């Protein structure tokens, strides 16, 4: 490949951090979260579980060190997700372990910015009843850091929900996809925790 | 750069997989999809095509092998998208080939998680008529794997649509951006296919 | 690690580009944008500022060169965001500098596709008043390239907003999260600029 | 076994690279991709998922060092895939984690060329509807590096799709199998990402 | 040509690195970035896109090995950009793929320093409105590694913006060109990402 | 992207100036300054500090050189502010370091004209007392080059203050926003220094 | 064809050099450059871009080896440009990627001399204003190696500009076409770079 | 002429071999031989000599080196036979030195292939007696390398004898022209020598 | 398919030649050229460019080897144009790169004869003025090998121009379509070059 690029990955991977938040100063890490709802694959009336094929856009900035002076070189490199720390975002009410559709690869930038987009199929609790009716049905699932409080991780969203990718001839039509950010509390801890509640309204076409 | 990081990329890239889904056991790959609608650049009344500047958040987990024992080292590395497998998510009704705004870089994590966020301008079919009226106009585009059925790839969404990034003084105001996941069928195949339908309601401000 | 992977990162990073848009021919770069609203952490009545914990899914394609003939090898690599060029997407009305929750890692693919997902906490202007009422309150923030016009960068969104990740017991319930793409103009320049307006309607549960 | 062969594997494995792309100079890694569609095992109308039994031919060249002077000796050796870096190629819309039919073994050549062919069963989103009709049904799935952009990994194909291996008495007849290479962009990143879209048209015989 | 020079290129190109960051030790790669704004070619009111003809100065240091003892010989050689790794710097909000005005050639120095300057035309989102007014209009575009976080790639700037080259009789007068460096975060990743925001204030003369 | 645009940026950035005022002949650089007062976020009675969310329109002309003959090509390009020289305009009485809301991107034009518009939150000294009264309260802050005298930098304003963007439901109503240009002297130096005094009269609505 | 000719091409192509400057001794490579201005196709007043249909005469000598003793045989052969190294000559200010009118074929001679003449349409920056006036308008574009300094590549011209081929009934009359050679410097490098500035004065007939 | 062609001849002639067989590896040189019998000019009964006007097609491949990278250029050049090595093919039983009708020019090809066709008048021993009879008369002459054994030079023939060119109103009619290849031995040497025996049967018309 | 046919393609493609002119003996390659003018799609008065939809009939004979004895089998096979060498015929004055309407497939025959017919849209320089007049307008474009001289490639035509296919209700009526063969010279080279000048006289009906 390119030798210049080669040095970059090795320096960051070999020299530049183990799993530890590199930021010493006054910063929580914000992670932008967006959902591209690909398809609502299936509904289970007996189980009251619904399946979503989604990919999640995750963006964050990590502190990286510039060592060897940056010359005009390879700006973004791609690396396996395993190589770097990723956020704990989880669906609060998944019925089953989510499965991963896509390769675990993340693009990293010199500024430290990282973009990771997994594709996933998730089963979440939701009653399908009245899917056939014109009114349709509503489901909600909340995503957010399991462990991190708002102080440690701040979640942000650019927009409501990305319908564009949605499969044209999906079994179910999308009434409205929303991603509203909310902060709430748990009995364990005094700290506020932030999650993104994805509320999807859909019916069978 | 850092030698420790250096070894990481090379081991994953040189030793650890060619384009092949690394997961042998009972897992489909789920890809989370989210849309950050940046701007609705233009509307064409004669053509009935509309232009969106979007970035797509894609997340997936790939199986990677740990070889050399992981010491505290570079957790995420960045690499070009070309280096690793990426999902086939496509807009079902694009008028033209989408163009890429941003560098193709993806951040990868040790767990195998990958985050890839492309920025794109897409032209899709949509009638602009009555954009001026208070009611505004509605458009929908579905994104989803072209080839993969729900069994192979499951799509998931965290939330509806990310408005926050939306340009303040865009030509068109955003009534509501939604990303609803749906599964549907095609005559070619008995399998369900999942797509995320992005339904955007907008009018000129 | 894997030697095969090793060569990949170095070739792309060391040999294959400095910060410069590699695409000579007729292409703007499109960046798909999606928001996964994790949580609405806090509201400040006196300040009229609201905090969102979000992650942003960003996807783009960069032109990379294949040098050493691609054998079946490591498809995605992960690299720090600093290594590669990332888009300038910014919140138009942030009160404060956004902080980064997650590591800056991006997965890159051989096709050149990059996925970067940062996690972020952002403070934006928004009046909280009447959060308690049933009607709730509405806020909007626009994200989009600061410098780039629609010609340089096109933004696209798959869906409205990803609620699924939203934290279950967040302080505030999500009425609806939307990401509508819009294009608008500024007095500085004749060119259209595209942004994604994230409109979030929420109330306290 | 043969002592001469013995030295070869150990030298390459023990001495000659960890996961790191070994190529410093001006080369992206190209990976040739071909599909041998073995069978379309099943179609699921409710799920809209289809199952393919495929093996994927992956070829790439890695840089290896000649140390001990090459005498006429064992030209190709076989080794477990785990030993060396493999590409991240993933199906964009797999419903589930792909499972692996065959042993993970790859033949390597002195020139550095590697041939790895996994056998896989993949579930992908696709509507089966109208499978019985004469017209049949069409499905598409895209394979490509998740993380790597076109700059890092370039994908190439020799031909359209390999029908010859196709099971004679499969439940479904093959109208046409195609593998067209395409490059596209994502909102995350400005870089182009390349994927191979496998479009399969089939009907029940 | 000169035989002495001849050996130099071949040794570096043939022997001395594939795409891999060559730096093992504690160094991120810093890439200096500067903009020479040549001209603001056009403004599009309907599209809200603006066109800039720019060349980008990119400088970085790669680790090269001295083999054959350096005698007084050819100090810099020139080579095609394809030969060596280049950074992923991309415009965050380009509407279209940037096109390349100049040959892709980069001068390399013995110390390892590389200077690459592409000339480019870029279309970026920006509202032209009020270009005629005395106040003029402001546009901003951010450039930075797509994939690389601040840890992998550090971006630096010598000065604000180079007006000197600016075309004398350009359609639009330059009020002020600024390049301020900033670091920000994305929802995907905890790491900080650094970008250079080019803010250009211009009006029609 | 577009190759034509590509050459432009590289030529200006790589070849066409480091931080140095390119103008040899009889010209001071004039920088037009305008304020768009977005919002008066907060008032602190104990501290006597007030917060303004503003964006500053800055325009200047830099001398650029035309090299490769300008063909009809990309007229404006966008670049990070870091790439080019920007003026030192500072608020004389900021209590704290101003924070930057927007990406640092500036549009540059062929004529050399540059438009840069940062968005900022600034804390300045000002007594809030009697904000509730009908009379309201007055505050003033002066912006101007710290180092540059009137001879080096001349500041100009098109109009008084831009209220239009002002947030409709801001905590404080705007009685009158004024930007009067004035020149004054300091004990350090015999030269006149020019600043723009922003006098804002506001009260709580 | 002729067997004698057959051996010639194969020997030079198969045996006699890869991309590397074959000249070891004290020689820079001189490339003669001449322009045959075919037509000025169009002028764009809004864009300030002008289109030229040109063919470029390029001549250089490469070192080739005589192997099989040269008998009276085929003196020049023709081959695709891809087969052999060609110079990087580029227009400094092209707005867009130049397009190629003619086949890429170059005649090579036994002495090593090569003649390559591409036909091209180029868009370059140039103000058309006052094209109608008797005075007409002047435009200039500079061509020259992007990477190569005067030491590596020396450019030479036989004459001013070739009008003879100029289309008789072109939209624009040619006042004077000039090709003056000049050497100039760039901030990147201490070395002199040589370019041919084509200054064309034309008006509408 | 063409400069490109010019370099070719000089490189091959000046740099690329003196009379020496350039092929080091396991190859004899094969020379294809064909005869185009133009005319049987005269018969001498007392002398028993017959005159043939023939041209001989000779083809061989020489190893040439490619130096300066082959661009699309002049594919075959022509050169005097003196310039390159030619085979020793001689008529075994010529009564007199053969005379040369045509210019000694040979076409050479890039692959190294050379085609040389001399035109010659040869006097060979042959009894004319019974030329008038219906049976006619037969003559044979053998051509082949004088010095070279079959190991050094291998002779090949495509076909029997080329009558087409034969002069229509020649004094003698051609019954049959044959060129059979044969290998035979001589007392001097143990090696086999190969010759082409031209057996011509002709009578007076 | 047919096994007999199968062997044929593989033998010719796999065994029987790489890009090299297979003919060693005294033959230039003649390529017959014919034009079937399908339609004159458009005329551009400002640009002085005209668009032709044409298909080009190209015929040539290549030397192929018969290996396995030809039995009565598949006489012509079809193959992609990429598989075999095609001539460099180019339009001398195309304004833009020609685009290809039809699949690149060529029929090959056992004798070695190949027939390739591309469909193309070409933009060429031509003044449209007086298209409306009865006299109409004349345009000419020359097609011919770019690199090859008359010695290497000889062009032949069967007839003047094929009107029969011409679209009945085309915007422009065809006065006369002619294809005259001519040979001419260029300053680069002493050799004659042959081209077919297509002179089309047309007017609006």
Numbering used by the authors:
A (entry chain A), B (entry chain A), C (entry chain A), D (entry chain E), E (entry chain E), F (entry chain B), ...: 1 to 205
Structure paper excerpt:
Acetylcholine-binding proteins (AChBP) have been described in several gastropods and, more recently, also in an annelid. They are homo-pentamers and water soluble homologues of the extracellular, pentameric ligand-binding domain (LBD) of the membrane-bound nicotinic acetylcholine receptors (nAChR) that belong to the Cys-loop receptor superfamily. In AChBP, the pentameric quaternary structure and the overall subunit features of nAChR-LBD are fully conserved; this also includes the typical pocket-like active site at the five inter-subunit interfaces, with several strictly conserved aromatic residues for ligand binding, and a C-loop for controlled access to the active site.
This bridge is lacking in all other studied members of the Cys-loop receptor superfamily, and it is also absent in BgAChBP2. The potential attachment site in BgAChBP1 for N-linked glycans, N176, is localized next to the C-terminus. The trigonal ring encompasses six different structural elements, each present as three copies: (i) Helix α1 close to the N-terminus of each subunit; (ii) disulfide bridge C16↔C64 that is specific for BgAChBP1 and tethers the C-terminal end of helix α1 to loop L3 of the same subunit; (iii) salt bridge R2↔D26 attaching the N-terminal end of helix α1 to loop L1 of a neighbored subunit from the same pentamer. These specific reinforcements of the N-terminal region of the BgAChBP1 subunit might be required for withstanding the stretching forces inflicted by the other three elements that form the inter-pentamer bridges: (iv) salt bridge D25↔R63 connecting loops L1 and L3 of two subunits from adjacent pentamers; (v) salt bridge R3↔E70 joining the N-terminal end of helix α1 and loop L3 from two subunits of adjacent pentamers; (vi) a central hydrophobic cluster of three F71 residues delivered from three different pentamers.
